[PDB]
Motif scaffolding. Structure first.
Motif, PDB file in Angstrom:
ATOM      1  N   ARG A  32       4.531  -4.919  -0.235  1.00 19.87           N
ATOM      2  CA  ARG A  32       3.908  -4.960  -1.385  1.00 19.87           C
ATOM      3  C   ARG A  32       2.419  -4.628  -1.073  1.00 19.87           C
ATOM      4  NH1 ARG A  32       4.261  -9.357  -3.708  1.00 19.87           N
ATOM      5  NH2 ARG A  32       6.075  -9.109  -5.386  1.00 19.87           N
ATOM      6  N   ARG A  33       1.920  -5.452  -0.014  1.00 21.29           N
ATOM      7  CA  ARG A  33       0.364  -5.459   0.374  1.00 21.29           C
ATOM      8  C   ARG A  33       0.240  -4.007   0.845  1.00 21.29           C
ATOM      9  NH1 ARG A  33      -2.375  -5.000   4.379  1.00 21.29           N
ATOM     10  NH2 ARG A  33      -0.597  -4.872   6.002  1.00 21.29           N
ATOM     11  N   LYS A  34       0.834  -3.584   1.817  1.00 17.74           N
ATOM     12  CA  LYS A  34       0.552  -2.173   2.618  1.00 17.74           C
ATOM     13  C   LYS A  34       0.853  -1.113   1.701  1.00 17.74           C
ATOM     14  CE  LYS A  34       2.828  -1.353   6.252  1.00 17.74           C
ATOM     15  NZ  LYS A  34       3.836  -1.034   7.512  1.00 17.74           N
ATOM     16  N   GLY A  35       1.834  -1.185   0.928  1.00 19.64           N
ATOM     17  CA  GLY A  35       2.071   0.003  -0.015  1.00 19.64           C
ATOM     18  C   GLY A  35       1.304   0.150  -0.972  1.00 19.64           C
ATOM     19  N   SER A  36       1.618   1.306  -1.753  1.00 19.36           N
ATOM     20  CA  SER A  36       1.167   1.495  -3.104  1.00 19.36           C
ATOM     21  C   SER A  36       2.230   1.753  -4.074  1.00 19.36           C
ATOM     22  CB  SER A  36       0.217   2.885  -3.049  1.00 19.36           C
ATOM     23  OG  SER A  36      -0.916   2.624  -2.217  1.00 19.36           O
ATOM     24  N   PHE A  37       3.079   0.810  -4.051  1.00 24.10           N
ATOM     25  CA  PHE A  37       4.391   1.020  -4.927  1.00 24.10           C
ATOM     26  C   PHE A  37       3.662   0.712  -6.412  1.00 24.10           C
ATOM     27  CE2 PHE A  37       6.225  -0.205  -1.146  1.00 24.10           C
ATOM     28  CZ  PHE A  37       7.446   0.479  -0.977  1.00 24.10           C
ATOM     29  N   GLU A  50       7.368   0.066  10.041  1.00 23.42           N
ATOM     30  CA  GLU A  50       7.205   1.587  10.177  1.00 23.42           C
ATOM     31  C   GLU A  50       6.565   2.241   8.892  1.00 23.42           C
ATOM     32  OE1 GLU A  50      10.788   3.805  10.595  1.00 23.42           O
ATOM     33  OE2 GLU A  50       9.846   5.787  10.744  1.00 23.42           O
ATOM     34  N   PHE A  51       6.930   1.528   7.555  1.00 21.60           N
ATOM     35  CA  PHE A  51       6.459   2.175   6.414  1.00 21.60           C
ATOM     36  C   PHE A  51       4.910   2.210   6.191  1.00 21.60           C
ATOM     37  CE2 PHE A  51       5.103   1.685   1.852  1.00 21.60           C
ATOM     38  CZ  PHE A  51       6.115   2.414   1.287  1.00 21.60           C
ATOM     39  N   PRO A  52       4.463   3.429   5.962  1.00 18.41           N
ATOM     40  CA  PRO A  52       3.024   3.709   6.082  1.00 18.41           C
ATOM     41  C   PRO A  52       2.249   2.991   5.052  1.00 18.41           C
ATOM     42  CG  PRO A  52       4.230   5.609   5.222  1.00 18.41           C
ATOM     43  CD  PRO A  52       5.128   4.675   5.555  1.00 18.41           C
ATOM     44  N   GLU A  53       0.885   2.799   5.367  1.00 16.31           N
ATOM     45  CA  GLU A  53       0.027   2.022   4.484  1.00 16.31           C
ATOM     46  C   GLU A  53      -0.160   3.089   3.511  1.00 16.31           C
ATOM     47  OE1 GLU A  53      -3.752   1.734   6.462  1.00 16.31           O
ATOM     48  OE2 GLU A  53      -4.597   1.450   4.450  1.00 16.31           O
ATOM     49  N   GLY A  54      -0.221   2.760   2.008  1.00 16.12           N
ATOM     50  CA  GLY A  54      -0.353   3.546   1.115  1.00 16.12           C
ATOM     51  C   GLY A  54       0.764   4.288   0.555  1.00 16.12           C
ATOM     52  N   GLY A  55       2.093   4.189   1.372  1.00 14.89           N
ATOM     53  CA  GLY A  55       3.303   4.713   1.088  1.00 14.89           C
ATOM     54  C   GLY A  55       3.868   4.368  -0.487  1.00 14.89           C
ATOM     55  N   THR A  56       4.829   4.978  -0.828  1.00 17.22           N
ATOM     56  CA  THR A  56       5.366   4.849  -2.214  1.00 17.22           C
ATOM     57  C   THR A  56       7.018   4.922  -2.016  1.00 17.22           C
ATOM     58  OG1 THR A  56       5.737   7.174  -2.976  1.00 17.22           O
ATOM     59  CG2 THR A  56       3.569   5.973  -3.379  1.00 17.22           C
ATOM     60  N   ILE A  57       7.638   4.743  -3.162  1.00 22.66           N
ATOM     61  CA  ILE A  57       9.028   4.854  -3.026  1.00 22.66           C
ATOM     62  C   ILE A  57       9.626   6.325  -2.495  1.00 22.66           C
ATOM     63  CG2 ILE A  57       9.575   5.565  -5.516  1.00 22.66           C
ATOM     64  CD1 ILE A  57      11.411   2.917  -3.426  1.00 22.66           C
ATOM     65  N   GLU A  58       8.739   7.160  -2.606  1.00 27.63           N
ATOM     66  CA  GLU A  58       9.084   8.458  -2.252  1.00 27.63           C
ATOM     67  C   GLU A  58       9.390   8.563  -0.565  1.00 27.63           C
ATOM     68  OE1 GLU A  58       6.792  11.893  -3.139  1.00 27.63           O
ATOM     69  OE2 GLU A  58       6.182  11.848  -1.101  1.00 27.63           O
TER      70      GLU A  58
END
Ligand SMILES: [Cl-]
Ligand SMILES: [Cl-]
Ligand SMILES: [Cl-]
Ligand SMILES: [Cl-]
Ligand SMILES: [Cl-]
Ligand SMILES: [Cl-]
Ligand SMILES: [Cl-]
Ligand SMILES: [Mg+2]
Ligand SMILES: [Mg+2]
Ligand SMILES: [Mg+2]
Length: 240
Positions: free
Chosen positions: A48-53, A78-86
């Protein structure tokens, strides 16, 4: 003068209620696939912190897929900072079917407050606890205009009012505006002076944006600038 509050982390300790709803929702779908491995708490927080979910339904979805793969720890990293569910959907080729996750999440978080509950469950919202003392809000309302700007929905805001034991007539909820959009604060205060009480950097940015666009307004961060909202309210009452 306005005193405007955030709700979560300022008026209400959301005693990781959302985090456990995310965990239980993911673990519900995992159980359908015969996966009994638990969702680790740091995975929820970090993702949640690193994502833009968009919401915790999306965070739950991500965790389900990651844990199905058996590499959740690695995938959180691995999940990118600012990543979404896409990113997740593109990687595994699969996504949520309709409102499956949302219905289960809301069952766990809202419980009997959710009219479309999938089963009877004592809502996790009831593990949230007031930080603010209602006597202070009552005292302050006699000398200051009080308001809230919150990411909560109207329904969730009614729940907050139950937890706190105080009703806010001036409230901006996510139906209207979302921090850190400064129009959320303008909506309430319309250029009149005041202060916003937040717990996060996003709250600080919100008010920086207001200063950038509209004009002066103070910001106080609980746990950095003051112990908590009650000490803040007592100082305000006792000395301006
Ligand atoms: Cl909190
Ligand atoms: Cl998303
Ligand atoms: Cl895993
Ligand atoms: Cl997508
Ligand atoms: Cl209940
Ligand atoms: Cl009091
Ligand atoms: Cl918020
Ligand atoms: Mg907050
Ligand atoms: Mg806590
Ligand atoms: Mg102190």
């Amino acid at each position: 003068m306005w005193i405007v509050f955030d709700v979560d982390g300022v008026l209400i300790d959301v005693r990781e209620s959302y985090d456990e709803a995310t965990k239980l929702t993911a673990e519900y779908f995992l159980g359908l696939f015969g996966v009994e491995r638990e969702i680790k708490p740091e995975w929820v927080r970090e993702l949640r912190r690193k994502g833009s979910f968009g919401d915790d339904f999306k965070v739950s979805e991500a965790l389900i897929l990651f844990a199905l793969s058996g590499r959740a720890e690695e995938l959180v990293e691995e999940f990118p900072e600012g990543g979404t569910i896409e990113w997740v959907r593109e990687k595994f080729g699969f996504q949520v079917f309709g409102g499956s996750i949302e219905r289960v999440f809301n069952t766990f978080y809202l419980g009997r407050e959710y009219p479309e509950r999938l089963f009877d469950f004592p809502g996790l919202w009831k593990k949230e606890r007031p930080i603010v003392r209602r006597g202070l809000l009552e005292r302050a309302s006699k000398h200051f205009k009080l308001g809230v700007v919150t990411g909560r929905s109207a329904l969730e805001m009614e729940l907050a009012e139950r937890i706190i034991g105080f009703k806010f007539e001036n409230a901006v909820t996510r139906e209207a505006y979302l921090k850190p959009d400064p129009r959320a604060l303008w909506e309430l205060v319309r250029g009149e002076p005041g202060v916003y009480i937040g717990d996060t950097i996003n709250d600080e940015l919100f008010v920086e944006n207001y200063r950038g666009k509209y004009g002066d307004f103070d910001f106080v961060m609980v746990g950095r600038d003051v112990k908590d909202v009650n000490e803040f309210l007592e100082n305000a009452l006792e000395g301006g």
